[PDB]
Write a protein that binds this ligand. Structure first.
Ligand SMILES: CCCCCCCCCCCCCC(=O)OC[C@H](COP(=O)(O)OCC(O)COP(=O)(O)OC[C@@H](COC(=O)CCCCCCCCCCCCC)OC(=O)CCCCCCCCCCCCC)OC(=O)CCCCCCCCCCCCC
Ligand code: BCL
Ligand code: BCL
Ligand SMILES: CC[C@H]1c2cc3[nH]c4c(c3C)C(=O)[C@H](C(=O)OC)c4c3nc(cc4[nH]c(cc(n2)[C@@H]1C)c(C(C)=O)c4C)[C@@H](C)[C@@H]3CCC(=O)OC/C=C(\C)CCC[C@H](C)CCC[C@H](C)CCCC(C)C
Ligand SMILES: CC[C@H]1c2cc3[nH]c4c(c3C)C(=O)[C@H](C(=O)OC)c4c3nc(cc4[nH]c(cc(n2)[C@@H]1C)c(C(C)=O)c4C)[C@@H](C)[C@@H]3CCC(=O)OC/C=C(\C)CCC[C@H](C)CCC[C@H](C)CCCC(C)C
Ligand SMILES: COC(C)(C)C/C=C/C(C)=C/C=C/C(C)=C/C=C/C(C)=C/C=C/C=C(C)/C=C/C=C(\C)CC/C=C(\C)CCC=C(C)C
Ligand SMILES: COC(C)(C)C/C=C/C(C)=C/C=C/C(C)=C/C=C/C(C)=C/C=C/C=C(C)/C=C/C=C(\C)CC/C=C(\C)CCC=C(C)C
Ligand SMILES: COC(C)(C)C/C=C/C(C)=C/C=C/C(C)=C/C=C/C(C)=C/C=C/C=C(C)/C=C/C=C(\C)CC/C=C(\C)CCC=C(C)C
Ligand SMILES: COC(C)(C)C/C=C/C(C)=C/C=C/C(C)=C/C=C/C(C)=C/C=C/C=C(C)/C=C/C=C(\C)CC/C=C(\C)CCC=C(C)C
Ligand SMILES: COC(C)(C)C/C=C/C(C)=C/C=C/C(C)=C/C=C/C(C)=C/C=C/C=C(C)/C=C/C=C(\C)CC/C=C(\C)CCC=C(C)C
Ligand SMILES: COC(C)(C)C/C=C/C(C)=C/C=C/C(C)=C/C=C/C(C)=C/C=C\C=C(C)\C=C\C=C(/C)CC/C=C(\C)CCC=C(C)C
Ligand SMILES: CCCCCCCCCCCCO[C@@H]1O[C@H](CO)[C@@H](O[C@H]2O[C@H](CO)[C@@H](O)[C@H](O)[C@H]2O)[C@H](O)[C@H]1O
Ligand SMILES: [Fe+3]
Lengths: 307, 43, 49, 55, 281, 43, 55, 55, 43, 43, 51, 55, 55, 43, 38, 43
């Protein structure tokens, strides 16, 4: 076959790129990292620099304490045994307080007090990382699109760990930290709420999740198909439409009767992905607070046959 | 002289205003705590 | 015509299964075959001329 | 001891006070949460039992 | 009616079949030999779904459900009201999907672009054929396929899943989920980054791709680059679908038990199976 | 000398302020620990 | 021994002191958590039983 | 033997020192964990039995 | 000399202050261990 | 000469200090093992 | 025969031959070891009353 | 016969020697593992029986 | 024998010594784990029986 | 001539040293086989 | 490679195959003397 | 000439001390096997 542009044929390397300055405090940038020739086949080879200001210190140290708190709980569950630790790794779980403790903070350490401590470190880590996404954009003079998109993911995460437990009135509703246990929580949640497939916002959230795979398959394939015309230089195509953007638009126009622009396809992109967790968080927040049996709700809303 | 470009004069003035906000907030907090302790002692 | 890396991937696949089977027998568990056969075949695949 | 002041010649004081404030806040919350999880030291539950408020 | 730049591209040729016979547009839509085919199969399948609703006795589009033949038919043809309509609609769907892909190929040829788009769509078709064709014929009955109905195909997903316990424990399904979640992450970041560069703070100049690299390096210490992110978004999407098809074609064909029991092979590796304590000891 | 470029005089002043805060913070903490140990000995 | 000071000619003191601060905190946390997880050494439970504070 | 110092003409001493320090801590931790998980050598439980600290 | 760009006197200056911190931290730790051992021996 | 740029004298200097740390660490470990062996022999 | 060194690069031929011949030889021994009439280690153990 | 050395004009000795090392180590490991998985040749168990080391 | 030194015309010593160090450590760890997995050669368990340290 | 750059002279030299390595390696193996055969014959 | 190099290399190669197959024939004889399969 | 850029004599120098490392390493191992064999013979 002809060249498909999925992996580069020739790598070139020059002086390391320290990045744009703008209003960035350059003292808070690291040096440049190594160049990975393995990554250079698919994307850029250069690693780093990374920016590490005040919110980054807060986020990383809080995130480290979250990860370390779970880790030491797993080593305790392993009985300090390195062979057992690796054998049972996916089976260990730091579990929320039992239902009889409600929202209180009185639960013992083994009985969910450690889960509260870890969750506090997680809360600080994630929210300080949100402010990091906002301020990194600010210092470069960029739009805040990344921080606002990330707020949709935080919305689902907040619903799962914080808002729905408070509305339900116990921490026991929250997700356990553990590989198989959070899967088991996911299955149990649907069984308790009478089949989550009949939650219409879960259905929408799936539609947007599939739509994200559809749209990125389309967009990624499109840009590679026009990459022979410089199509992946999307900002310059936005500033000065070339034949790459015109051929991309006409392919979809002739295929399905309408098309995007080089800017506006990224507006479809951001919203398609955002809507996954926006609708997701609504669907979960409604579950148990408003609808405790989604199949029966579906029967009463014309989407499942009556008994 | 420092990182912010505030003069020492500006830094002294700002601190005097800031500390008056801090004392005001903490005074209200102290009164709130006394009222709650009188109402319902936590020791 | 078959490029060196394409040849390397084919031979690495042959090496993966052959080394996998013999170490699965020698190690007394198929996972030993997967681990040894995999890491050896990866070393082979990474190293075209 | 007396020469510890030269720390500020190698570390930017902005970073140190941030990293220290972050550390002290997280440590303080962690210890208070440990005591709240500890029935013998949960001062809210202690005062409830002391004053017959647990009902 | 044309886009203002469109006329220079509407030239003859690039067709796979039919020459000039179908080489024309109906409004924006290019036709071609496969456009004729696609429309016929699509219209026929749609009208047969509506007719299946007449037989079912419902006009609520959420309750319309065309079920495949019962297992007692095996791989034979069924009575039309008893699953033969599902068979014809499945042929129409397959005809429409394949015709649509082949029509995209001749659109690619006329525009001189690469074939990545119809190639990418073929993964979605093969996933569909996994669930309606390859897996049912391995299992020996059409009745293992899913029904064509908005909520009833979710009943098939639920019933198929719980046949093997919690389906989360399917290892290929775990991999597929990870690609799906990673793809949606990458799409959000990519959309946001291009928009944040093209639409800066008020009154600023457009940001360059160098600012796009800089933002991600500052944020996570790495930037995959403008070419790399489109390669990534394609391969994440296709890998998600490939591992989806794999997770199903093995299910009920080489694996039959509760998927949670599969993971015991790791726990019962002989060098640690008997060590006391932990979760499994 | 050093990486920050602070003068030795600046570093001495800054340390004297910092240590004044450290001793202030630790004095409050010592009083808090004494009050808690007198209230409820943990040894 | 006495020539050990040349380590600061090989390793940047800023990177070492950050790395060492993280190391010593996580080590100290781990050991306190191990002892809290140990019924013979959990000082909070020891004092609870000693002073009859619980049950 | 005494030509061993030429190892520093080949290996960057920074990369050696980092690699060695990580290696030595992880090895030490690994061994202490093996002994904590070994009932005949868990010193915390051994002392608990010696001093009758439970029951 | 040096990868860090420090002179021998600078490295020797810095090390003297680092070692004084290490010994002070060690002394506090030794007293802590002694107190815990006298309170509750682990051997 | 060397890949690292260290001269023979620089390598001799560095090794002499490194080796003294190695033997110091070894001596502490030997005392540590000896104490543990007297406390609780493994052989 | 000898024209094969024109049909192919010799390196590929020697790589392919060497790999295949080893995998062939190994599996033949594994077949003999998995055959009770030919496992030399088991035959020896029975002869010398080791088990 | 004599000309077997000309293989080193067609293969690079770095590649051959690394492949030889990997080959020989794997072969040796495989053979030792088979003998260990053969009770009549597992030397550790033979010694354990010879010296009556179990019970 | 004598001419084996020419291996350092073929192999760069830096890369070999890294690979060799890793190889030797993993080989040692492998053998120690084999012996620990063996009741007749797990020194920690042999010790526990010799001194009657468990029960 | 061939792809990998060593001359005919270097190929002869390298092969002679290489074969001496093989004979040393195989000699050690032959002794190990003799020792194991004398201890526990596999035929 | 030239045609001459192909003839040269093949004449070397076949001498290696003669040695390997001769050792194999001796090994099959040794197994036959030990324990025939027919 | 050499793929490493070492001269012949540089390779002789490096090998002569490399072998002394192997002989030291194996000598320590031989003592380790001797002690372990005396403690618990595997033949
Ligand atoms: C907080 C956690 C919760 C969940 C929260 C989840 C939020 C997810 C938001 C994702 C937005 C992605 C799109 C985007 O462009 O983002 C960047 C954009 C611009 O960046 P910039 O730096 O500030 O400006 C750059 C400048 O160059 C301009 O750039 P640009 O031109 O691209 O910006 C204009 C965009 C941005 O607009 C928005 O983002 C609007 C977001 C609205 C979210 C509402 C979702 C929930 C309600 C629905 C739930 C429905 C189910 C209940 O313009 C647009 O995208 C326009 C979109 C038009 C949609 C029209 C819909 C009309 C429907 C009504 C029709 C009525 C007919 C009678 O940022 C913003 O403008 C600010 C976004 C603020 C987000 C909501 C924050 C939370 C609001 C609620 C709490 C506070 C208020 C009570
Ligand atoms: C993939 C693995 C499972 C499966 C599991 C699920 C689960 C689980 C969910 C869905 C959901 C949906 N599925 Mg289903 N589904 C499968 C196979 C299919 C096929 C198919 C031909 O193979 C189709 C067309 C659909 C169609 C649909 C939609 C009704 C809905 C939203 C999808 C979406 O937005 O996707 C991405 C595509 C886009 C965003 C583009 C727009 C697509 C439009 C909306 C599709 C309309 C389909 C139409 C109603 C069907 C009739 C066609 C007409 C006769 C022409 N499913 C198989 C059996 N599907 C969700 C839902 O809400 O169900 C009620 C849901 O919860
Ligand atoms: C038996 C199981 C149940 C079921 C129960 C649930 C439950 C319960 C939930 C979902 C949810 C989801 N389900 Mg459902 N679901 C089932 C069947 C399906 C099927 C199918 C084919 O059958 C599909 C495709 C889906 C699809 C989906 C998604 C659309 C949705 C999750 C979106 C997302 O990205 O979340 C993943 C993303 C997040 C959670 C956001 C995370 C953001 C945070 C901030 C990240 C922090 C990272 C942390 C700090 C660590 C970083 C470390 C790094 C090293 C740096 N479900 C059946 C019926 N499903 C969710 C939902 O929204 O429902 C409406 C949900 O809660
Ligand atoms: C719109 C919905 C989608 C979405 C979007 C989204 N996510 C986002 C963003 C956006 C737009 C961001 O801007 C943000 C980001 O930064 O992306 C690069 C983020 C992000 N999405 C993330 C994850 C994530 N997103 C997910 C999903 C989704 N993201 C949705 C599909 C999922 C899942 C389950 O589906 C996950 C897991 C992160 C990569 C990032 C947010 C990072 C964050 O908040 O981190 C806090 C924690 C830390 C900084 C560190 C934690 C601890 C680590 C172990 C590091 C330790 C470091 C230490 C120095 C070493 C210690 C070693 C010792 C222990 C040995
Ligand atoms: C492989 C990666 C992802 C992918 C990629 C992808 N899809 C694509 C493409 C690509 C690259 C296209 O080029 C093509 C396109 O043109 O997009 C606009 C397409 C497309 N992906 C589509 C949908 C779609 N893709 C999906 C999935 C995915 N597509 C993957 C996740 C999904 C789901 C459920 O996950 C859906 C719904 C269409 C928008 C479009 C193909 C349009 C097409 O085939 O047109 C001709 C046919 C018709 C117009 C209608 C036919 C009607 C039938 C005869 C009757 C209905 C039968 C059906 C089985 C009924 C089902 C009922 C449901 C309730 C179950
Ligand atoms: C794991 O289990 C538990 C948690 C139970 C047990 C373990 C606990 C552990 C491991 C605890 C560890 C604790 C440690 C190490 C604590 C250390 C604390 C320190 C170092 C505190 C220091 C505080 C210093 C303060 C508050 C200083 C404040 C300074 C000021 C207010 C002055 C500010 C102004 C300045 C500097 C301006 C000067 C400017 C110019 C220009 C001269
Ligand atoms: C599974 O098997 C188990 C785990 C059960 C048992 C087996 C365990 C095994 C296999 C263990 C193996 C252990 C090994 C290989 C240990 C090796 C240890 C070594 C080699 C340690 C070396 C330590 C060296 C030290 C501490 C050196 C310190 C040196 C300094 C502090 C000074 C550095 C030099 C300076 C500053 C001079 C700078 C000079 C100039 C001119 C700039
Ligand atoms: C049972 O639990 C486990 C398994 C964890 C048992 C095992 C435990 C293990 C493996 C523990 C290992 C512990 C180790 C390796 C500990 C090492 C500790 C060290 C290296 C501590 C060093 C401390 C140094 C200190 C506290 C230095 C402090 C310095 C200052 C306070 C002054 C700041 C610095 C200045 C002013 C220098 C700048 C000056 C100028 C003139 C530029
Ligand atoms: C369970 O029973 C099983 C299944 C295992 C039965 C099956 C057994 C099988 C199939 C066994 C296969 C065995 C084979 C194929 C063995 C092959 C062994 C070989 C070919 C070994 C070769 C060893 C060679 C060595 C050690 C050579 C070393 C050479 C050097 C150290 C010097 C290298 C040359 C130099 C430095 C000169 C450089 C020259 C210049 C001019 C710079
Ligand atoms: C499968 O089941 C089991 C494992 C039970 C049985 C099987 C076991 C097997 C197959 C074991 C195989 C073992 C082997 C092959 C072991 C080989 C070990 C070797 C080759 C060890 C060599 C060690 C060498 C050392 C430690 C050398 C150190 C060198 C130095 C300290 C010198 C550094 C300085 C130099 C080189 C000078 C640099 C010069 C200039 C001019 C810059
Ligand atoms: C090698 O060993 C060491 C120890 C060195 C390292 C090992 C670490 C390991 C093995 C770590 C394991 C980590 C795992 C398995 C993590 C799994 C995480 C998962 C799967 C999480 C899934 C979902 C979590 C959610 C939805 C959590 C949401 C939480 C929030 C929204 C936080 C809300 C805040 C709360 C509840 C705090 C309220 C309390 C106060 C005081 C404000
Ligand atoms: C991509 C499209 C996927 C869907 C494709 C569907 C294609 C269907 C083609 C059917 C072809 C004819 O299939 C034929 O069906 C009949 C009727 O059931 C089967 O007949 C079977 O059932 C009937 C009764 O129902 C018995 O009398 C008969 O003895 C038995 O064999 C035949 O054994 C089979 O050969
Ligand atoms: Fe793009």
């Amino acid at each position: 076959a002809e060249y498909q542009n999925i992996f580069s044929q020739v790598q070139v390397r020059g002086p390391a790129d320290l990045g744009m300055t703008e209003d960035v405090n350059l003292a808070n940038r690291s040096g440049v990292g190594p160049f990975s020739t393995l990554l250079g086949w698919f994307g850029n080879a250069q690693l780093g620099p990374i920016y590490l200001g005040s919110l980054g210190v807060l986020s990383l140290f809080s995130g480290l304490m979250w990860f370390f708190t779970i880790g030491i709980w797993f080593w305790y569950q392993a009985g300090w045994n390195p062979a057992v630790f690796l054998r049972d790794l996916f089976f260990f779980s730091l579990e929320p307080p039992a239902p009889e403790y409600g929202l209180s903070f009185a639960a013992p350490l083994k009985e969910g007090g450690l889960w509260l401590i870890a969750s506090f470190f997680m809360f600080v880590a994630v929210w300080s990382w949100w402010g990091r996404t906002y301020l990194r954009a600010q210092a470069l003079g960029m739009g805040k699109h990344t921080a606002w998109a990330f707020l949709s993911a935080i919305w689902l995460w907040m619903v799962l760990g914080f808002i729905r437990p408070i509305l339900m009135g116990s921490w026991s509703e929250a997700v356990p930290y553990g590989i198989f246990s959070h899967l088991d929580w996911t299955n149990n949640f649907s069984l308790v709420h009478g089949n989550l497939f009949y939650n219409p916002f879960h259905g929408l959230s799936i539609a947007f999740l599939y739509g994200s795979a559809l749209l990125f398959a389309m967009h990624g394939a499109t840009i590679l198909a026009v990459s022979r015309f410089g199509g992946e230089r999307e900002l310059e195509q936005i500033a000065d439409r070339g034949t790459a953007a015109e051929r991309a638009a006409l392919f979809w126009r002739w295929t399905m009767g309408f098309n995007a622009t080089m800017e506006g396809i990224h507006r479809w992109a951001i919203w398609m992905a955002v809507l996954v967790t926006l609708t997701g968080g609504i669907g979960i927040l409604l579950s148990g607070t408003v609808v405790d049996n989604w199949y029966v709700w579906g029967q009463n809303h014309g989407m499942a046959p009556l008994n | 002289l420092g990182y912010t470009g505030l003069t020492d004069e500006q830094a002294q003035e700002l601190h005097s205003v800031y500390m008056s906000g801090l004392w005001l907030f903490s005074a209200v907090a102290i009164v709130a705590h006394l009222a709650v302790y009188i109402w319902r002692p936590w020791f | 015509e078959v490029s060196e890396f394409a040849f390397r991937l084919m031979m690495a696949a042959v090496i993966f299964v052959g080394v996998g089977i013999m170490f699965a027998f020698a190690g007394g568990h198929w996972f030993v075959g997967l681990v040894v056969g995999g890491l050896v075949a990866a070393f082979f695949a990474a190293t075209p001329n | 001891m007396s020469k510890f002041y030269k720390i500020w010649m190698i570390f930017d004081p902005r970073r140190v006070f941030v990293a220290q404030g972050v550390f002290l806040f997280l440590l303080a919350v962690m210890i208070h949460l440990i005591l709240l999880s500890t029935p013998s030291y949960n001062w809210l539950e202690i005062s409830a039992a002391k004053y017959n408020r647990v009902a | 009616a044309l886009l203002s730049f469109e006329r220079k591209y509407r030239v003859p040729g690039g067709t796979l079949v039919g020459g000039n016979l179908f080489d024309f547009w109906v409004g924006p839509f290019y036709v071609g030999f496969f456009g004729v085919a696609t429309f016929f199969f699509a219209a026929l399948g749609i009208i047969l779904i509506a007719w299946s609703a007449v037989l079912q006795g419902t006009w609520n589009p959420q309750l319309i459900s065309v079920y495949p033949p019962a297992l007692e038919y095996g791989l034979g043809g069924a009575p039309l009201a008893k699953g033969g309509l599902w068979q014809i609609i499945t042929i129409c769907a397959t005809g429409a999907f394949v015709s649509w892909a082949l029509r995209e190929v001749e659109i690619c040829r006329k525009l001189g672009i690469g074939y990545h788009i119809p190639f990418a769509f073929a993964f979605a078709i093969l996933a569909y054929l996994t669930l309606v064709l390859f897996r049912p014929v391995m299992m020996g009955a059409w009745g293992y396929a899913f029904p064509y109905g908005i909520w009833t195909h979710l009943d098939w997903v639920s019933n198929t899943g719980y046949t093997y316990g919690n389906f989360h424990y399917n290892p290929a399904h775990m991999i597929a989920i990870s690609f799906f979640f990673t793809n949606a992450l990458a799409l959000a970041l990519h959309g946001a980054l291009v928009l944040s560069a093209a639409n800066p703070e008020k009154g600023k100049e457009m940001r360059t791709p160098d600012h796009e690299d800089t933002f991600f390096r500052d944020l996570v210490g790495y930037s995959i680059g403008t070419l790399g992110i489109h390669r990534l978004g394609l391969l994440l999407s296709l890998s998600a679908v490939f591992f989806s098809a794999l997770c199903m074609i093995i299910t009920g064909t080489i694996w039959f038990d509760q998927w949670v029991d599969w993971w015991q092979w790791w726990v019962k590796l002989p060098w640690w199976a008997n060590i006391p304590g932990g979760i499994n000891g």
